[PDB]
């Protein structure tokens, strides 16, 4: 089997993408946030707190057919901007692009934090890091993908997200017509539950590639780069006027600039983000400074390949027996 659903920006800054999901019988379609940071799917629902529901779409299981308590399961999960979310689990029908789970960990929200609440056009999340990571207690659970794995015509999905525009998920299959040139792979580990891998290096602009191993996540549902410190004042160096605030709460930028590309290494291949895809605008409607793209991961505690950097590309998540991360440019 395969599935090829087409991801949306939620906004004109790319700050997140939504996908179309299709749950319990007959379908209720919610658009979610596919996350390859996380692994819980969980989604706005006729559990959640009215207080904390803002225009989205809600899942109502009383109405699926196919729904049924997973009796006793509970999940709470915290992400790294600070936002969280908890509920209890119902298993139900799940369908992306035309690839259909049975029997799939469906989360329904008894509260979500504000940040949550006050975005209107995200319905959910779906996780798709590995299985490890999963917040149902006292049963874990598995990801849509893990699911849905042996079913594949191949054990892969891929992300080929957009600048300003929408892109595609796909499941079982690597489009050859969605890229250009040929895929590098390289190694992932997964021990700490993420798609982390080791990029070979960076440039900024035209400049010099620095050989540097930089140890990272591939994740589709954070929006920045998240670099080590070293490698972000490099980058910012080459823009006039650029500095860190800690008012604002990272690097900022003339909105007159120019910005320099930032090539990232994949073994011996290399992926460029155009200068762009960097600009995050305005820090606040009317202003002069904008707010930059690629940040410091310090105080993170992980460097994060966000959209900024996995949308300047073609990427293939291999989640065969030994997975591993793919690459090309687009």
Request: one cysteine or more.
């Amino acid at each position: 089997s395969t599935g090829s659903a087409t991801t949306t920006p939620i906004d004109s800054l790319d700050d997140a993408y939504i996908t179309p999901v299709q749950i319990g019988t007959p379908a209720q379609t919610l658009n979610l946030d596919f996350d390859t940071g996380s692994s819980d799917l969980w989604v706005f629902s006729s559990e959640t707190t009215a207080s904390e529901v803002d225009g989205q779409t809600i899942y109502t299981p009383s109405k699926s057919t196919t729904a049924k308590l997973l009796s006793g399961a509970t999940w709470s999960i915290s992400y790294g901007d600070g936002s969280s979310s908890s509920g209890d689990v119902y298993t139900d029908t799940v369908s992306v692009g035309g690839l259909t789970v049975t029997g799939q960990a469906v989360e329904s929200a008894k509260k979500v934090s504000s940040s949550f609440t006050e975005d209107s056009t995200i319905d959910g999340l779906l996780g798709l890091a590995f299985s490890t990571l999963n917040t149902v207690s006292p049963t874990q659970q598995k990801t849509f993908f893990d699911n849905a794995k042996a079913s594949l015509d191949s054990p892969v999905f891929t992300a080929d997200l957009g600048y300003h525009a929408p892109g595609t998920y796909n499941f079982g299959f690597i489009d050859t017509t969605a890229y250009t040139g040929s895929i590098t792979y390289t190694a992932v580990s997964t021990k700490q539950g993420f798609w982390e891998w080791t990029s070979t290096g960076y440039a900024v602009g035209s400049g010099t590639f620095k050989s540097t191993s930089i140890d990272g996540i591939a994740d589709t549902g954070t929006t920045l780069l998240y670099l080590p410190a070293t490698v972000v004042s490099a980058y910012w160096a080459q823009v006039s006027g650029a500095k860190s605030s800690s008012s604002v709460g990272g690097y900022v930028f003339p909105c007159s600039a120019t910005l320099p590309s930032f090539t990232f290494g994949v073994g011996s291949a290399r992926i460029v983000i155009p200068g762009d895809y960097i600009d995050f605008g305005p820090i606040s409607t009317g202003s002069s400074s904008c707010f930059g793209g690629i940040q410091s991961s310090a105080g993170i505690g992980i460097n994060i390949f966000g959209d900024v950097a996995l949308k300047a590309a073609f990427v293939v998540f291999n989640g065969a027996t030994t997975p591993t991360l793919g690459f090309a440019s687009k």
